[PDB]
Amino acid sequence: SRPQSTLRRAITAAYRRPETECLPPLVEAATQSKEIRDAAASTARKLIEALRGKHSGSGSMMGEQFVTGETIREALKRSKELEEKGFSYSYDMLGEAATTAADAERYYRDYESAIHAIGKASAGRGIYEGPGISIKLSALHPRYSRAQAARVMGELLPRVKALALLAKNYDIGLNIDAEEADRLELSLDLLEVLCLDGDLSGWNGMGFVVQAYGKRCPFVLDFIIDLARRSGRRIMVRLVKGAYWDAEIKRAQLDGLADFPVFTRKIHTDVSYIACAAKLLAATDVVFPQFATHNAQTLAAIYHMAGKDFHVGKYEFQCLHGMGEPLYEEVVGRGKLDRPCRIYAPVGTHETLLAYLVRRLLENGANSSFVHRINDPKVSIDELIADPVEVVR
Amino acid sequence: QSTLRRAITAAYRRPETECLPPLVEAATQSKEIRDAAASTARKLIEALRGKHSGSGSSGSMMGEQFVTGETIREALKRSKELEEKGFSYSYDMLGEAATTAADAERYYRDYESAIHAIGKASAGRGIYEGPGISIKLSALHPRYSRAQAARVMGELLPRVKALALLAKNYDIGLNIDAEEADRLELSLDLLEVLCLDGDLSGWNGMGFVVQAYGKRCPFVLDFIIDLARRSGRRIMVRLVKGAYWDAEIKRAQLDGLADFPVFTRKIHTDVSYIACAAKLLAATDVVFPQFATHNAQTLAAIYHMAGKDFHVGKYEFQCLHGMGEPLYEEVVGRGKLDRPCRIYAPVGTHETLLAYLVRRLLENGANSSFVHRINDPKVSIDELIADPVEVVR
Numbered sequence: 178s179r180p181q182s183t184l185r186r187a188i189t190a191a192y193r194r195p196e197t198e199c200l201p202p203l204v205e206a207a208t209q210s211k212e213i214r215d216a217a218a219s220t221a222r223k224l225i226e227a228l229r230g231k232h233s234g235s236g237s238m239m240g241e242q243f244v245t246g247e248t249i250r251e252a253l254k255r256s257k258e259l260e261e262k263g264f265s266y267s268y269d270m271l272g273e274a275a276t277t278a279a280d281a282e283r284y285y286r287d288y289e290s291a292i293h294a295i296g297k298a299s300a301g302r303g304i305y306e307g308p309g310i311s312i313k314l315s316a317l318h319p320r321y322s323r324a325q326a327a328r329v330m331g332e333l334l335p336r337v338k339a340l341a342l343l344a345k346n347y348d349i350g351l352n353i354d355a356e357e358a359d360r361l362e363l364s365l366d367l368l369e370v371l372c373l374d375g376d377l378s379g380w381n382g383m384g385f386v387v388q389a390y391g392k393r394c395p396f397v398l399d400f401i402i403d404l405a406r407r408s409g410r411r412i413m414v415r416l417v418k419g420a421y422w423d424a425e426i427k428r429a430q431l432d433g434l435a436d437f438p439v440f441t442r443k444i445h446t447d448v449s450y451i452a453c454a455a456k457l458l459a460a461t462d463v464v465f466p467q468f469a470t471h472n473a474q475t476l477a478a479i480y481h482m483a484g485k486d487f488h489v490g491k492y493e494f495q496c497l498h499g500m501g502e503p504l505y506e507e508v509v510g511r512g513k514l515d516r517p518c519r520i521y522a523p524v525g526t527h528e529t530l531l532a533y534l535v536r537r538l539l540e541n542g543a544n545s546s547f548v549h550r551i552n553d554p555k556v557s558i559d560e561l562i563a564d565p566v567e568v569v570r
Numbered sequence: 571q572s573t574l575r576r577a578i579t580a581a582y583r584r585p586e587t588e589c590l591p592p593l594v595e596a597a598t599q600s601k602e603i604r605d606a607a608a609s610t611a612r613k614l615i616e617a618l619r620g621k622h623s624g625s626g627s628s629g630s631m632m633g634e635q636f637v638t639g640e641t642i643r644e645a646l647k648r649s650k651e652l653e654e655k656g657f658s659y660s661y662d663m664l665g666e667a668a669t670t671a672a673d674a675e676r677y678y679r680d681y682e683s684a685i686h687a688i689g690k691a692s693a694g695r696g697i698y699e700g701p702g703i704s705i706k707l708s709a710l711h712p713r714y715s716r717a718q719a720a721r722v723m724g725e726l727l728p729r730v731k732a733l734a735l736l737a738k739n740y741d742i743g744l745n746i747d748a749e750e751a752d753r754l755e756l757s758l759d760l761l762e763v764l765c766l767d768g769d770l771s772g773w774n775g776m777g778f779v780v781q782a783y784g785k786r787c788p789f790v791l792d793f794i795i796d797l798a799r800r801s802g803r804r805i806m807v808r809l810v811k812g813a814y815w816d817a818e819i820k821r822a823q824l825d826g827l828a829d830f831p832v833f834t835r836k837i838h839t840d841v842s843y844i845a846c847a848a849k850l851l852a853a854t855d856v857v858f859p860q861f862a863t864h865n866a867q868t869l870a871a872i873y874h875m876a877g878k879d880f881h882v883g884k885y886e887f888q889c890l891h892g893m894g895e896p897l898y899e900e901v902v903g904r905g906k907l908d909r910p911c912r913i914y915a916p917v918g919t920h921e922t923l924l925a926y927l928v929r930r931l932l933e934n935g936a937n938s939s940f941v942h943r944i945n946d947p948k949v950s951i952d953e954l955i956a957d958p959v960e961v962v963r
């Protein structure tokens with residue numbers, strides 16, 4: 178059969194599978210024992226009570242708090258304080274959706290210079306304890322969303338390979354951010370080619386994001402875990418819910434779709450995230466799970482799902498600069514939960530901030546978001562710590 | 571179809587360089603007016619920079635700064651303080667881009683109930699001294715942008731007419747907000763039908779927004795001014811720059827068009843606004859101009875262009891709730907410029923607030939926006955009072 182025919186066919190089959198058909202296997206995989214659910218509820222209650230206690234009871238629209246620096250040099254200087262406490266960083270040179278070849282070339286050079294600076298700052302700390310970088314493929318090919326995959330692939334692959342080689346040379350992480358649903362397939366084919374490229378051998382810093390609001394998420398994870406097994410690379414896998422929900426809904430409506438590529442009920446994304454976390458936690462020999470979330474209930478659920486055995490390098494949590502520090506200050510550190518957290522740290526100016534800021538406003542301003550609900554007087558602590566899997570079981 | 575309508579259609583995507591010369595000419599003011607406006611603008615900006623207005627005051631992503639109240643009853647109670655200072659209100663029941671019949675029906679009921687509450691609160695103060703309402707056509711039809719314009723107008727017409735008749739019953743203003751460029755034509759056709767409908771005779775509260783960032787703006791104004799003169803309806807015309815610029819640019823780039831329906835240089839929109847303001851000020855016999863802006867240079871130019879004769883009902887300024895009060899506190903009242911300002915006042919829950927908030931983020935966060943520059947230490951007062959015609963190059 179075609180290489181990985183079964184795994185690839187499962188991804189394609191899920192693309193726009195009816196939401197009601199996607200959920201039952203996820204609900205079963207996300208169901209935890211009463212004993213774990215009770216312990217997770219107690220942990221989540223503590224995290225929320227601490228969140229407010231140290232921040233005047235609270236759980237800017239201009240978003241200066243979302244950018245760590247205007248240049249990589251400035252961002253690296255401002256990272257020392259939180260690294261001393263046990264946080265790590267992943268730097269994001271802001272910029273995406275290149276419209277011209279010159280723009281894509283400028284973004285490439287920004288990433289290249291950033292890797293040199295981050296690699297020097299890492300100073301041999303390696304991919305888990307030291308800083309890394311995150312990149313967006315849409316920054317590196319003009320009209321990434323429009324051109325045929327063969328053209329986008331043949332030009333993008335040498336650029337990403339060159340960046341990955343530099344990250345290998347400094348032994349830092351290099352993560353491919355996940356963007357719109359229609360570019361998942363291309364990005365995953367690129368990940369495969371890089372993981373099978375012998376020039377990158379011996380480096381486990383290649384990382385890839387999977388969005389749990391997507392119907393393909395568990396099948397993409399199956400493909401990635403199998404790719405790790407056959408390539409010999411321990412792939413870093415950032416599990417997120419997803420940043421483009423409002424845009425995906427609008428696009429699917431304009432595409433005339435009867436079934437969308439993302440879930441439309443928020444708790445279905447929560448169930449998908451927990452089910453996918455269970456899959457990742459059973460594969461830590463071959464992937465490095467990175468649980469990106471600001472939701473204290475999700476965090477507590479995974480913390481207890483992962484069990485008592487932990488070492489740095491097994492898995493980590495992640496958060497966004499300007500959103501997650503108050504929560505993760507109750508997580509990192511021996512007297513807290515003793516689990517590491519990597520801060521995603523945007524670097525740039527107003528000329529590159531708006532697209533990211535809009536996604537942050539849609540995240541922070543939505544009534545369904547944990548970060549909004551924690552400040553909503555109508556939402557009880559009972560509701561914040563409730564397991565969403567029990568709502569749909 | 572008419573000569574005036576043909577001028578609108580022909581300008582839809584006219585090359586930007588061809589649009590500018592007639593706007594530059596019409597926006598050119600005499601030396602005496604330019605000097606007086608520079609003095610007034612400097613005074614306003616010096617007062618603004620003693621305050622803490624602009625983008626830095628936009629508050630948190632909860633959006634609290636931008637919403638007047640959760641319900642119309644709450645919003646009406648909170649309007650008394652500013653109404654006695656010389657402000658009026660236009661209430662906006664939040665909600666737009668209905669995707670289902672149920673949603674469009676709910677938005678209709680919200681508008682209808684707001685008209686009854688606003689009309690009772692107006693208590694015979696009339697369309698200039700008393701409060702009004704603003705509506706979005708996309709809230710009232712479930713496929714406003716995705717169905718044939720002819721059919722959309724025909725189903726929308728009875729709903730808008732019913733709301734207009736209620737507004738006539740109480741003698742309040744009812745404004746149709748302007749949305750995306752591809753719906754200008756439909757909304758203008760609806761305005762014409764309403765202004766020729768004898769059931770609405772004797773009421774001057776019908777209002778309509780025109781966006782100066784659009785290439786069709788001056789020609790839309792010529793059509794509306796002629797419609798007012800021939801119909802005997804003193805149409806309230808809200809002149810704005812426009813709220814959807816980023817979306818219009820992205821849509822136009824995707825559609826592969828060489829010439830967009832909006833200007834692409836901010837200074838061109840500023841020139842267009844002043845040119846269109848000159849056209850409206852020459853037509854105050856037949857239309858009621860409403861100059862919506864937070865830009866102190868734009869305001870000062872219009873104040874001087876309008877001349878010394880003023881009476882309530884000649885024209886007014888307008889601002890957005892949570893953005894315009896610092897500037898307009900230097901305008902309303904007998905100790906200031908003694909000109910009225912109507913506050914656009916959103917009403918609704920946090921859920922319905924989100925889409926409006928995104929447009930406020932794009933407005934407040936853009937380095938080119940007056941409200942951002944007023945706080946920017948790199949921007950001089952000299953630059954803020956520059957006359958757009960003298961700067962365009």
Ligand SMILES: Cc1cc2nc3c(=O)[nH]c(=O)nc-3n(C[C@H](O)[C@H](O)[C@H](O)COP(=O)(O)OP(=O)(O)OC[C@H]3O[C@@H](n4cnc5c(N)ncnc54)[C@H](O)[C@@H]3O)c2cc1C
Pocket residue numbers: 353354355356386388390415417418419420421422440441442443444445446469470471472475495496497519520521540545546547548
């Ligand atoms: C370090 C880090 C890196 C990230 N990288 C990426 C990336 O590369 N690509 C990407 O797309 N996202 C990425 N994200 C995720 C995104 O930016 C948001 O931070 C995340 O989705 C919020 O989830 P939460 O668990 O913190 O919050 P929660 O409030 O628990 O969940 C909110 C999420 O639920 C989803 N949602 C909301 N409404 C609905 C609905 N009606 N139906 C279904 N789902 C719904 C959306 O995904 C929304 O963001 C990243 C997040 C972090 C912290």
Ligand SMILES: Cc1cc2nc3c(=O)[nH]c(=O)nc-3n(C[C@H](O)[C@H](O)[C@H](O)COP(=O)(O)OP(=O)(O)OC[C@H]3O[C@@H](n4cnc5c(N)ncnc54)[C@H](O)[C@@H]3O)c2cc1C
Pocket residue numbers: 746747748749779781783808810811812813814815832833834835836837838839862863864865868888889890912913914933938939940941
């Ligand atoms: C009471 C009120 C009601 C309004 N109603 C509507 C409505 O119904 N529909 C609507 O679309 N808008 C409406 N607006 C306008 C919109 O929401 C913004 O408030 C307004 O455009 C900001 O203009 P300004 O003169 O305050 O600021 P300025 O800073 O002087 O101007 C900013 C504006 O310039 C334009 N612009 C920015 N960059 C560029 C560029 N590169 N090229 C071209 N133009 C550019 C945009 O229109 C932007 O908003 C309304 C505004 C007010 C105050």
Ligand SMILES: N#CCSCC(=O)O
Pocket residue numbers: 354355420497521533536537
């Ligand atoms: N969050 C995150 C990293 S990728 C999506 C975005 O940039 O918002």
Ligand SMILES: N#CCSCC(=O)O
Pocket residue numbers: 747748813890914926929930
């Ligand atoms: N400003 C304004 C009223 S209409 C456009 C929007 O709602 O942003």
